[PDB]
């Protein structure tokens, strides 16, 4: 018995390099693999090339990167090890990559010209030459202009424009863009068309807390800041009224409306707890929890010459300063094997909360502190139980009260083994923030009976990133070693997060082949791969002046094309929505993961699919077949 | 149009210069309005009677930031009265006095503007002036078109010599000089209309008008006291090409800030020993223009 | 000094070239011609030096811009 | 007048884009630690505000990268803010405000401000007579100078006020344009 095993992503992409991971288990000496991808069903041979040999020098582990040219489409992969031939049918995706759109402003007047770029990139964020359709939809959803343009030799950037007619529908327009080949996968930005003129100053309202506690009787205390777009503080008078939102329904609290002076660019206002309740007056205070608050400020300069409106919205009403989230924690535990929880503690608005202690039910010591990204990791132990695990984490912030702590409950089901072999694998890694350049220790924990532990001489680990296989290797292991550690090096290639999945295999129960696997998702500190700073290149000195020449310094990646744009900060007083941001990008990129679970699965076959991989062996062990284009829900 | 707030602004003198600025902006709705405001501006040179400000300052539903109430004459040409609420039944009225310190001629109409804080759109602007109708300056609007008529009027009624005439009348802008008869006179609400026959064409620019053709001149009614043009008498005048109104050769002319006015005594009037001097100057002007033309 | 009055002279030459250029330049010269003229007519050392530097500088920037 | 800047010499400010510098730079600049650095010479637009500059890079090796904004504030001790509305109605009299800012730390200003003449408008400015007030402005403080006018013809019509301060040779003028629209 040699077992041959074949691994590739759940979903394969066209016109891009995918990797096939070839293995020979319990085999002797050289073995030739020829790998092949045909159409489905039938025979076309969409790619023949890629041939290689596994050597005991490489413990029988191999790459081979192939590229597939170019109802739902499927290919058939088929690798031949010597004579024995393994084949799996994988789902295919026409999605070339991503599109990102940039508008010079967020808001425009009729009869001005919208300037917009479109960035064309593959599923690994690199620039690409393709054909794209673009569409300017009016605010009632009507396509009112379309250019079909190709970004070949464009170097990833498609500058465009469109003049708004003097006569046109006010409101939120959209720019929808899609790849010729992937018309179902569409991309959008919005922009406001409106009649207006840039104000001369900006107005800022922040509550002293980013939320309201329904028993805080001081009320909701607000600061109103005003300041001309050029620095200097504003002198004037201000009108602020409040209101309640739930959920798209707004109710003003007229009794709340106050007129206050703005002196040295600041005024202060409050919505007394009284007036809030007398205002909505649902039977009890606790009714308001889960609803949001808004402050609407209107500021008039003393000249009367300029005026400005402004709003902070969605201040949540809460019984607690925090929220707990198991969205980063695997929902499958390995009986007898520690169960690690990534507790994610946020503030009421959504930001990560930092330095927040959390503990399990009772606990009764335990406890660990939330890190920068609002993640802390608690580990409990599991028994030989198959019953569902129901853990409950409460926050243990001092200075609070049992009332004010947040809570949450979650449930994991056990990983089922091959005929109850009570063999398992458990990956653990340290929860701290991860930057590229650092190195990460990935703890391989193993659970099985000493009668069989010695057969496990190695683990296979695959790194998943942006839905492609990024790195795969072997982590060795000497009999008796329960814990081994693979010191993984984190490069920029890992941003903005990666899954590590690993598996050992052996013959066991009754001469039965057994694949045992685990996985885990790890978050890299989001940032640019390269870099881009725009600073003053006017070494020294003081303010520049209307009309004057000014020198700019651009620091970024070699041979990179840089595209600028400059906007009057007054434009942003009027609309700050829909701005382009490296973050908005990575977020797109994560929401395109072919991986669905935070780690682990129901059985070995799950661990793989959930992390985004397919597994197939000469013995017949393998993942279910993925035929759905997205994750389930 | 003042859709949501009926607004009336009144300027009458007082019982250095000083006067009474009043107002009243009713709300065109079914209830009273939310705190509302007036962006008040002043006829050039005036500043509020600081005292009269405080009578307004402590009032019920009345406030002026201790910021403005304090500037005084100094340079307080803007101020905002915050009327807590507003009426829709009759009209919240109030008034106060302004003293245009440092008397200076040719003043500007004040523009009082009101709005409900939460809405700059539903506002309004009504003007005022010691001598102008409801604050609107003087314009001349004939249909879709228009122009300005708030200057001084006809050319200045220090001596009026003969070298002086031959000058002006040869500066660039000047496109015509005629001896004329005032044929008929039609007056109407906006513009009078003096139709005149051209008796001799001294200088001749763009207008290909012959002598006797007869062309038509206009004027704002606020330009009759000082013109006293009289049918059947003769006249010498000239004007700029920028006073042409219309499209050939039903252009009328405009008597304007740069148009010359002069009454040409009849032929037997040239005898009075008080008339001759103007009867010889002009003949000694006609004669130069027709012979020599213009220098440049 | 006299060295200033010399610079003033160049102002017409420079303003002439500074007409390809942002209004700023042809406007800095204006700003500093009035300053020069009126300082030379008081002999104030401070006001003249001030202006002498202002001209030197703006001409140089104008130079640099034009050379490129 | 005595010791101020002559109106004819004041070149007004005119270029007030909401956006610009819509440029494209490659970074072929002889690299230096995978880090290339360009310098770029731009000429600022006459707006007195804070430009927010946004750079986005595209390398077939590193992918797409959106920078953090870079703010630039463009100011003057003394300057006019000519606050026009978006549009006006032909033949309707409206008021506009010319706001004067004096930002010197302790040093008031005697300033003459003038609304220039347009035949497209009707104001106290005529082709022969000027419309100048002379105002004094405290330090770190602003002044509102109103202007009643009437648009005569439709289209994109333009308003201009200038101003200079005495004894000092500071000067500034603004020439914005707004939309005259038919009754």
Swiss-Prot record, chain A:
What are the annotated disulfide bridges?
Answer: 596-631
User: What stretch of the parent protein is included here?
Assistant: 23 to 664 of 1663
Site (described: (Microbial infection) Cleavage): 510-511
Which species is this record about? Answer: Homo sapiens (Human)
Q: Which residues are glycosylated?
A: 63
The record lists the effect of residue 71 to G as: In allele C3F; risk factor for ARMD9; results in decreased binding affinity for regulator factor H; results in reduced sensitivity to cleavage by factor I
Q: What is this protein called?
A: Complement C3 beta chain
Give all Phosphoserine modified positions: 16, 48, 266, 272
Q: Which gene encodes it?
A: C3
């Amino acid at each position: 018995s040699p077992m041959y095993s074949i691994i590739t992503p759940n979903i394969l992409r066209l016109e891009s390099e995918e990797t096939m991971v070839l293995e020979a288990h319990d085999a002797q000496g050289d073995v030739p693999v020829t790998v092949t991808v045909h159409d489905f069903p039938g025979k076309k041979l969409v790619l023949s090339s890629e041939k290689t040999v596994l050597t005991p020098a490489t413990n029988h582990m191999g790459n081979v990167t192939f590229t597939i040219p170019a109802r739902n489409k499927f290919v058939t992969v088929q690798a031949t090890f010597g004579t024995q031939v393994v084949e799996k049918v994988v789902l295919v995706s026409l999605q070339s990559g991503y599109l990102f759109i940039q508008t010079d402003k967020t808001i425009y007047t009729p009869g001005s010209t919208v300037l917009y770029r479109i960035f064309t990139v593959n599923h690994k964020l690199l620039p690409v030459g393709r054909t794209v359709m673009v569409n300017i939809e009016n605010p009632e959803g009507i396509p009112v202009k379309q250019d079909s343009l190709s970004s070949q030799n464009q170097l990833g950037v498609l500058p465009l424009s469109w003049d708004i007619p003097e006569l046109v529908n006010m409101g939120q327009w959209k720019i929808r863009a899609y790849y010729e080949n992937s018309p179902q996968q569409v991309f959008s930005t919005e922009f406001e068309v409106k009649e207006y003129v840039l104000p001369s100053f900006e107005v800022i309202v922040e509550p002293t807390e980013k939320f309201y506690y329904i028993y805080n009787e001081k009320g909701l205390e607000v600061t109103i800041t005003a300041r001309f777009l050029y620095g200097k503080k504003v002198e004037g008078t201000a009108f602020v009224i409040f209101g309640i939102q739930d959920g798209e329904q707004r109710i003003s609290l007229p009794e709340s409306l106050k007129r206050i002076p703005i002196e040295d660019g600041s005024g202060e206002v409050v919505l007394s707890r009284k007036v809030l309740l007398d205002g909505v007056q649902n039977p009890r205070a606790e009714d308001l929890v889960g609803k949001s608050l808004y402050v609407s400020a209107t500021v008039i300069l003393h000249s009367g010459s300029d005026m400005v409106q402004a709003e902070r919205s969605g201040i949540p009403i809460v019984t607690s300063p925090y929220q707990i989230h198991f969205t980063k924690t695997p929902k499958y535990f390995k009986p007898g094997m520690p169960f690690d929880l990534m507790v994610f503690v946020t503030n009421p608005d959504g930001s990560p909360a930092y330095r927040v202690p959390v503990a399990v039910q009772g606990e009764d010591t335990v406890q660990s502190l939330t890190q920068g990204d609002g993640v802390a990791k608690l580990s409990i132990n599991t028994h030989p139980s198959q019953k569902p695990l129901s853990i409950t984490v409460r926050t243990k912030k001092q200075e609070l009260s049992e009332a004010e702590q947040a809570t949450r409950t979650m449930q994991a089901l056990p990983y089922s083994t091959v005929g109850n072999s009570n063999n398992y694998l458990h990956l653990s890694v340290l929860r701290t923030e991860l930057r590229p350049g650092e190195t990460l220790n990935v703890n391989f924990l193993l659970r099985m009976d000493r009668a069989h532990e010695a057969k496990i001489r190695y683990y296979t680990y695959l790194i998943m990133n942006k839905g492609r296989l990024l790195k795969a290797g072997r982590q060795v292991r000497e009999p008796g070693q329960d814990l081994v550690v693979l010191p993984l090096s984190i490069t920029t290639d890992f941003i903005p997060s990666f899954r590590l999945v690993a598996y050992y295999t052996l013959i066991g129960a009754s001469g039965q082949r057994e694949v045992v696997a685990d996985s885990v998702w790890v978050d890299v500190k989001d940032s640019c791969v390269g870099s881009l700073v725009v600073k003053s290149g006017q070494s020294e000195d003081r303010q520049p002046v209307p009309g004057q020449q000014m020198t700019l310094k651009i620091e970024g990646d070699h041979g990179a094309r840089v595209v600028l744009v400059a906007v009057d900060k007054g434009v942003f007083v009027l609309n700050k929505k829909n701005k382009l941001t490296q973050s908005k990008i990575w977020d797109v990129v994560e929401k395109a993961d072919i991986g669905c679970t935070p780690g682990s699965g129901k059985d070995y076959a799950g661990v793989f699919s959930d992390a985004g991989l397919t597994f197939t062996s000469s013995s017949g062990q393998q993942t279910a077949q993925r035929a759905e284009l997205q994750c389930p829900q | 149009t003042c859709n949501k707030f009926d607004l009336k602004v009144t300027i009458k003198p007082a019982p250095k210069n000083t006067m009474i600025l009043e107002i009243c902006t009713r709300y065109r709705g079914d209830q009273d309005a939310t705190m509302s405001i007036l962006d008040i501006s002043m006829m050039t040179g005036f500043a509020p009677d600081t005292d009269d400000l405080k009578q307004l300052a402590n009032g019920v539903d009345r406030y002026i930031s201790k910021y403005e109430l304090d500037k005084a004459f100094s340079d307080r040409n803007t101020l905002i009265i915050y009327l807590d609420k507003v009426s829709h039944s009759e009209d919240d009225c109030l008034a106060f006095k302004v003293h245009q310190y440092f008397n200076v001629e040719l003043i500007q109409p004040g523009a009082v503007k009101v709005y409900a804080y939460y809405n700059l759109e539903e506002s309004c602007t009504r003007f005022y002036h010691p001598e102008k109708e409801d604050g609107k300056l003087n314009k001349l609007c004939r249909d879709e078109l228009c122009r300005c008529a708030e200057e001084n009027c006809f050319i200045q009624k220090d001596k009026v010599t003969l070298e002086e005439r031959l000058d002006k009348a040869c500066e660039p802008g000047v496109d015509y000089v005629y001896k004329t008869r005032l044929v008929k006179v039609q007056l109407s609400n906006d513009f009078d209309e003096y139709i005149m026959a051209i008796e001799q064409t001294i200088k001749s620019g763009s207008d290909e008008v012959q002598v006797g053709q007869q062309r038509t001149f206009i004027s704002p009614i606020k330009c009759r006291e000082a013109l006293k043009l009289e049918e059947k008498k003769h006249y010498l005048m000239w004007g700029l090409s920028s006073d042409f109104w219309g499209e050939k050769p039903n252009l009328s002319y405009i008597i304007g800030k740069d148009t010359w006015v002069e009454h040409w005594p009849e032929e037997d009037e040239c005898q009075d020993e008080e008339n001759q001097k103007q009867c010889q100057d002009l003949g000694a002007f006609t004669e130069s223009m027709v012979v020599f033309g213009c220098p440049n | 000094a006299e060295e200033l009055r010399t610079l003033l002279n160049k102002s017409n030459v420079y303003a002439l070239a500074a007409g390809s250029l942002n209004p700023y330049y042809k406007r800095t010269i204006m700003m500093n011609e009035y300053r020069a003229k009126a300082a030379l007519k008081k002999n104030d050392f401070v006001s003249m030096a001030d202006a002498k530097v202002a001209l030197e500088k703006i001409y140089k920037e104008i130079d640099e811009i034009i050379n490129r | 007048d005595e010791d101020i800047i002559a109106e004819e010499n004041i070149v007004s400010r005119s270029e007030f884009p909401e956006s610009w510098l819509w440029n494209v730079e490659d970074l072929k600049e002889p690299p230096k630690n995978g880090i290339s650095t360009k310098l770029m010479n731009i000429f600022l637009k006459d707006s007195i505000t804070t430009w927010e500059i946004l750079a986005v890079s595209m390398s077939d090796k590193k992918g797409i990268c959106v920078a953090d904004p870079f703010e630039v504030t463009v100011m003057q001790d003394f300057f006019i803010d000519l606050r026009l509305p978006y549009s006006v109605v032909r033949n309707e009299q409206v008021e506009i405000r010319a706001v004067l800012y004096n930002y010197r730390q302790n040093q008031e200003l005697k300033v003459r401000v003038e609304l220039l003449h347009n035949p497209a408008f009707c104001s106290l400015a005529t082709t022969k007579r000027r419309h100048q007030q002379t105002v004094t402005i405290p330090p770190k403080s602003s002044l509102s100078v109103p202007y009643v006018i009437v648009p005569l013809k439709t289209g994109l019509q333009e308003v201009e006020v200038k101003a200079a301060v005495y004894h000092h040779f500071i000067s500034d003028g603004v020439r914005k344009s707004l939309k005259v629209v038919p009754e």
